[PDB]
Amino acid sequence: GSHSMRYFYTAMSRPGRGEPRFIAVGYVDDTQFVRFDSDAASPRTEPRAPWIEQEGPEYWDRNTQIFKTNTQTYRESLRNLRGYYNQSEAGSHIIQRMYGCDLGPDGRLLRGHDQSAYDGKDYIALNEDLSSWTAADTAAQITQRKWEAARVAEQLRAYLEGLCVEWLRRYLENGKETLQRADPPKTHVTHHPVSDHEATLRCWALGFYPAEITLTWQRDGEDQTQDTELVETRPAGDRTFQKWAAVVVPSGEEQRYTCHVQHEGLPKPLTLRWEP
Amino acid sequence: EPLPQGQLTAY
Amino acid sequence: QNIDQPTEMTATEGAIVQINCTYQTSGFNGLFWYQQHAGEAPTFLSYNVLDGLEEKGRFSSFLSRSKGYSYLLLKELQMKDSASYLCAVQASGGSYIPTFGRGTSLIVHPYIQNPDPAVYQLRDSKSSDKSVCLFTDFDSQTNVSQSKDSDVYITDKCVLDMRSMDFKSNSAVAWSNKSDFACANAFN
Amino acid sequence: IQRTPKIQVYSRHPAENGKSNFLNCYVSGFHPSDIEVDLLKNGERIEKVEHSDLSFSKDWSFYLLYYTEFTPTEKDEYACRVNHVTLSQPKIVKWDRDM
Amino acid sequence: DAGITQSPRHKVTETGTPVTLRCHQTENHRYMYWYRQDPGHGLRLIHYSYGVKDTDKGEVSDGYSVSRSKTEDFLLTLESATSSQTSVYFCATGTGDSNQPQHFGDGTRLSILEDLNKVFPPEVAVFEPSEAEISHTQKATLVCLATGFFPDHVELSWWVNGKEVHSGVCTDPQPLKEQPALNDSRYALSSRLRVSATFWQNPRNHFRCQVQFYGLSENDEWTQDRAKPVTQIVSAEAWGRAD
């Protein structure tokens, strides 16, 4: 199976309250492993996965430094942007960034990513070549000139094709038994009347990893793609996820309907009916 | 392992 | 990070020298080369992070990431290229702080067209005071021995450039704080 | 530049009266960051509500998990109260054990 | 001089004495470094700063201390100077970007001694060109010998007719120990200046050899008989001789 590393940055300005807040979170696949908040008691990188706790003091010192240096830089960035858009200090503003590398079900690098946003809108993004930038508006074109002059695309390519890959591989081995082995869903079907002769058949899926899951209803052999209430995949809060798919069926006609589950941890796609 | 940057990486 | 490069290299002007640098590095995030003249600060020459040959004038920089190998290739070697050459590596290991190898001393030898080795005795200006020996005009491949008996002092060879006449020459110096001393056996 | 928070209330494990569990309020799809999420028992504010670290999706929309240990009864009703800049008034969502 | 200023440039102190070196910049760079250079070794990191009041240890940090109170300055303190801390010290600055070079300062020659009474200025002498050399080559070489100085903190420059010259000038890269097999032996330094036979034979030509010595001063208690070996210039000269 494929694996990917991602870091997520949020830089929020908050004038009238004080200096901007910087939050950084690292993910391997759907597992968060590190967090860094500028507002925490003593700003340092904190472990969020068990397998990363084996990394030495040298690892946490360096991460700490790197994030502390970004604290000042994204604060600086927030002034620069407030300068390009000519924005007053009357408003709170947000810089978002996400970068990282994907690996194939083979271990080999598939591609790299580096995207940034301002006030929730695309701002600047690294291209597929890792040599150039796409700017969204003319404010980002000033950023583009700054980054070209300083050859920043170089730094990123050295990371995405280099450090990003090597470190991801290290993390994948260090915690292979939670990062490379997949948790299958715990599936069942509930029956619940909502009238005097038409009832709900809800297909539950609980305790699975990663979040990738397909839940579908079928009658006679045809997908009920129309008449299905389908919730968003939701975190259980214990490194597992949840989802269900529900359909309203005419009473005494339950056993025409079948739920279908597709998920990495399942050796084969599962078929379920309601069990009287 | 985060992306190292520093000044000149500012927006 | 164990950065590893040769201690000392030797070539003649107009030639081509290759300075090897190998690093044992996981966490590699770039290689730097610096030129350092003796008694002076190191100056920047090249930044290398991608595999390939990168030309910047008469200096080339090569890197092979897989094998942890890098060389700096100097062509059309000049007298001013005489200097130390620094290999610097940024790794995750410490932090991405440029960590330096021992450096490589490069000596560039002048081409002596018509060598005419000789020893002369030079006298002091003052007053009742006396002399010193000068070994001069020898070819660049002549080794200069150091002192013995301890009462004698020999300086290393050193190249001077008579720019007007376009004239380069080597020279060593011997002097003694004892009466019994002749220049004919000084560089024996 | 402005998006409304989706809300889901649910338990970590299937709800079985008597057994200790975790009440979860999953807020997603919102921009900007500042959100006020509070969990209610019988309509009263539960103290010691821990939350996940601010993170976002591909379309830059934030998500957060707020949670608290609890023990369902046929008597105790549970809720999540969420207030964001997009909402004119705090939206309250009830805990249905079969949703 | 790329905005970077080191002070002091040369310093000689007694062992067990506080010493501080100053690194100053005018370019606002977030990162600053203190390295040392020792024979056999390359540059070795002592301490580095990644922002105001943000500092960390390098490879050789023992006996060293640093403060980054402001952006302009990165200060290096040796609380109790040991003879092992005798070295050349380099300070550098950078933007922090992994693809940008470090900018290094001009250096600092720091000597730490058990006994300041071991400090001696150089005695400079000038040896005039040999006649045998003149007839054989139509070229004349003067030799300058500086001797008896301690430590090796000297700068040798040639002057002809009131003007500094570099053409035909050659000086030893490194001084020589006068007593090689002896701790804290005094040093010597030679240099040569080759001019034409006719240039030397002109009596209106003044050939002066200058040696800049860096020793004690301006405090350094001195309770000795011989003159205080302060920072000073010693010269020796010769006039052109007619055939």
Domains and CATH numbers, chain D: 1-99 (2.60.40.10)
Distance CA E151, CA E185 (A): 9
A194 dihedral zone (left: phi>0; alpha: psi -120 to 50; beta): alpha
Spell out a b/e string for C93-124, using b for 16 or more CB atoms within 10 Å of the CB, else e.
Answer: bbbbbbbbbbbbbbbbbbebeeeeeebbbbeb
- Residues contacting residue A149 through CB under 8 Å, at least 6 positions apart: none
Rg of chain E over Cα atoms, rounded to whole angstroms, equals 22
Degrees, nearest 5: CA angle A137-A138-A140: 70
Close Cβ partners of E73 (under 8 Å, ≥ 6 residues apart): E22, E23, E24, E25
B–E CB contacts, 8 A cutoff, strictly below: 20
With vertex at residue C113, the alpha carbon angle to CA C112 and CA C116, rounded to the nearest 5 degrees, is 75
Q: How many residues comprise chain E?
A: 243
> Using CA of residue E146, residue E150, residue E154, residue E159, what is the dihedral sign?
negative
Residue E106: phi and psi, rounded to 5, are -75, -10
Amino acid in position A110 = L
Token digits of residue A182: 């997949």
HSE (side-chain half, CA atoms, 13 Å) at C154: 19
Closest C-alpha among A243, A1, A205, A186 to residue A110: A1
* Whole-number Å distance between alpha carbons of A71 and A77: 10
> To the nearest whole angstrom, how far is the Cα of A12 from the nearest Cα of chain E?
22
Residues of E in contact with C150 (CB under 8 A): 179-181
Instruction: Provide CB contacts within 8 A for E205, sequence distance 6+.
Output: E160, E161, E199, E239, E240
CA distance C30 to chain A (A): 8
Domains and CATH numbers, chain E: 1-114 (2.60.40.10), 115-240 (2.60.40.10)
Q: Does B11 contact A63 at a Cβ distance shorter than 8 Å?
A: no
End-to-end Cα spacing for chain E: 47
Quickly count: other Cβ atoms within 10 Å of residue D51's Cβ: 13
Q: Which two tokens stand for residue E140?
A: 């004349």
Beta carbons of A234 and D33 less than 8 Å apart: no
Domain ranges of chain C: 1-110, 111-188
CATH superfamily, domain A182-272, is Immunoglobulins (2.60.40.10)
B2 touches chain C (CB under 8 A): no
Specify the 3-state DSSP secondary structure of E80.
coil
Strand ranges for chain E from DSSP E: 5-7, 10-14, 19-24, 31-37, 43-51, 54-57, 65-67, 73-78, 87-94, 103-104, 108-113, 123-128, 139-149, 154-160, 163-165, 169-171, 176-177, 187-196, 206-213, 232-239
On whether the CB atoms of residues B2 and A62 are closer than 8 A, the answer is: no
Q: In whole angstroms, what is the distance from residue E80 CA to residue C84 CA?
A: 32
**Of all helices (H) and strands (E), which one includes residue A57?**
helix A57-84
- Domain limits, CATH 3.30.500.10, in chain A: 1-181
- Per-residue tokens: D7: 């809300």
Q: Cβ(C119)–Cβ(C112) under 8 Å? A: no
Q: Where in chain A is the domain with CATH 2.60.40.10?
A: 182-272
Among C1, C27, C28, C3, residue whose Cα is nearest residue C86: C3
CATH class of C111-188: mainly beta
Q: Judge contact between E98 and B4, C-beta under 8 A.
A: yes
Contact of C47 with chain B, judged by CB distance below 8 Å, is answered with no
Residues of C with CB under 8 A from a CB of A: 26-30, 49-50, 65, 92-95
What is the spatial distance between Cα C110 and Cα C131, in angstroms, rounded to a whole number? Answer: 29
**Residue A30 amino acid letter:** D
C-alpha–C-alpha distance, residues A117 and A20, integer Å: 16
Contact exists between B and D (3 or more beta carbon pairs < 8 Å):
no
Q: Is E97 in the A-facing interface, judged by CB distances under 8 Å?
A: yes
Compute CA distances E48 → A42, C176, D86, E69, whole Å. 21, 48, 47, 13
Q: Which of E231, E229, E126, E128 is nearest to E186 (CA)?
A: E229
Of E30, E56, E97, the CB nearest to A150: E97
Which tokens belong to E17? Answer: 């004495």
C132, E145 Cβ separation under 8 angstroms: yes
What residues contact B9, with CB distance under 8 A and at least 6 apart? Answer: A73, A147, A150, A152, A155, E97
**H/E element, D68:** strand D62-70
Nearest CA-CA partner of A117 in A101, A100, A93, A87 = A93
Among the listed residues E17, E219, E232, E227, the one whose alpha carbon sits nearest the alpha carbon of residue E117: E227
Q: Write the secondary structure of A192-233 as one string of H (helix), E (strand) and C (coil).
A: EECCCCCEEEEEEEEEEECCCCEEEEEECCEECCCCEEECCC
Please, are residues B11 and A33 in contact by the beta-carbon 8 Å criterion?
no
Tokens of C131: 């002399």
Q: Which two tokens stand for residue A188?
A: 């069942």
Angstrom distance (rounded) from CA E103 to CA C41: 9
Question: Tokens representing A127?
Answer: 């291209």
Please tell me which residue of chain B has the smallest CA distance to C92. Answer: B1
Closest to D99 (Cα-Cα) out of D82, D79, D81: D79
- C1-110 has which fold? Immunoglobulin-like (2.60.40)
Bridge pairing between strands C104-109 and C8-12: parallel
**Which residue's entry shows tokens 């301690």?**
E150
Distance CA A83, CA E87 (A): 48
Tell me the CATH number of domain A1-181, given options 3.30.70.1380, 3.90.800.10, 3.30.500.10, 3.40.140.10. 3.30.500.10
This structure's resolution (Å) is: 2.7
Tell me which chain B residues have a C-beta less than 8 angstroms from the C-beta of C96: 4
Among chain D residues, CA nearest to A230: D99
Search chain C and give the residue with CA nearest E182.
C150
> What's the rounded Cα separation, in Å, for the pair D33 and A93?
10
- C174: which DSSP letter? E
Kind and range of the H or E element at E140? strand E139-149
Task: Give the distance between the most distant pair of CA atoms in chain C.
Answer: 69
Q: Are E243 and E203 contacting, i.e. CB atoms less than 8 angstroms apart?
A: no
**Rounded distance, CA A29 to CA A176, Å?**
12
- What stretches of chain E show up as alpha helix (H) in DSSP? 131-137, 197-200
**Chain centre to alpha carbon of residue E155:** 6
**Distance between CA A11 and CA A70 in Å, rounded?**
10
